[PDB]
Amino acid sequence: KDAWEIPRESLRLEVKLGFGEVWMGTWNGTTRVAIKTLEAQVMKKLRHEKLVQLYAVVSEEPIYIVMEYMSKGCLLDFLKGEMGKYLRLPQLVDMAAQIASGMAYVERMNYVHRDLRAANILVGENLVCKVADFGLARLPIKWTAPEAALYGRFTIKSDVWSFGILLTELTTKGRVPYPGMVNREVLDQVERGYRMPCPPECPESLHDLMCQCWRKDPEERPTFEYLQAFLEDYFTSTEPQYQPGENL
Ligand SMILES: */C=C\C(=O)Nc1ccc2ncnc(Nc3cccc(Br)c3)c2c1
Secondary structure (H helix, E strand, O other): OOOEEOOOOHEEEEEEOOOOEEOOOEEEEOOEEEEEEEEOHHHHHHOOOEEEEEEEOOOOOOOEEEEOOOOOOEEHHHHHOOHHHHOHHHHHHHHHHHHHHHHHHHHOOOOOOOOOOHHHHOOOOHHEEEEEOOOOOEEOOOOOOOOHHOOOOOHHHHHHHHHHHHHHHHOOOOOOOOOOHHHHHHHEEEHHOOOOOOOOOOEEEEEHHHHOOOOOOOOOOHHHHHHHHHOOOOHHHHHOOOOOOOOO
C-alpha cells in the first residue's frame, strides 16, 4: 500500500450519475468528491490545474478511485445539452486552450493520454475544462491517429491528432466526427488522405489548426505547447476581426 490509499469509512457515496459506474460523494465529511468504481499510478505522478485531480485510491476490490469533483459533467454532454445552444466561438476556443494547456503539461512529462476526446474532458464552474480518464495511459478509432489505430504507435503526437478531432466536436456542439461514416470507411478514407472539411461558421484559420493536427506525418503535427499559445492568443493574433454568427 502507498500514501494515496485510504479507508472506505471516510467515503460517503451519495448520487449516481452515471467498465463500471461513477458517483458523487464525500471524503472526510468536509470534502465533496467523485468516485470511479471498477495499475494506474499515472494519475499519481500527474498533477496540473487542467487535469482532473486524483485524491485517493482503494484496493483490495471492490476498487474505488477518488477524483476532484467536476460539477458540470463531461464535455460531450455539456456541448450537446442546453449549454450548446449558447456556446459561441470565444467560449469554445477558450475551452480548447484549457484542454491544450492540460495536454501541454502531459507533453512536458513524456506521457501519452491515448483516449483524448470530448467524452474524456470534464467541465466545471465558470467553463473550466480539465482533462480526465487516463484509461489507457503510458510511457474508438474516429479520434485515433492512423499510425496508432493501425500499428499501436501511440505518442503525444497521436494525442495531438485526437485533439484536432476534439476540435471538431467543440465547434459542431458535440457531433460525432465523420458524419455518416462508419469505422472502416474512416480508416480507409483517411488512409487516402481525406480530412474533415471546415465546420459551418468555423473560421478557415482554426480549421488549419485542425489540418495541421491531422498531418499524415506524426512529427509534422504541432506541439500542445504551440496549440495552447495559438488558442490563447486566437482573437488578437489570428482572428482579430471575429464577429458572432448565428452558431459560432
Ligand atoms: C461524456 C460521458 C461521461 O463520461 N460522463 C460523465 C458524466 C458526469 C461525470 N461527473 C463526474 N465525473 C465523471 N467522470 C469521471 C472521470 C474520471 C474520474 C472520476 Br472520479 C469521474 C463524469 C462522467
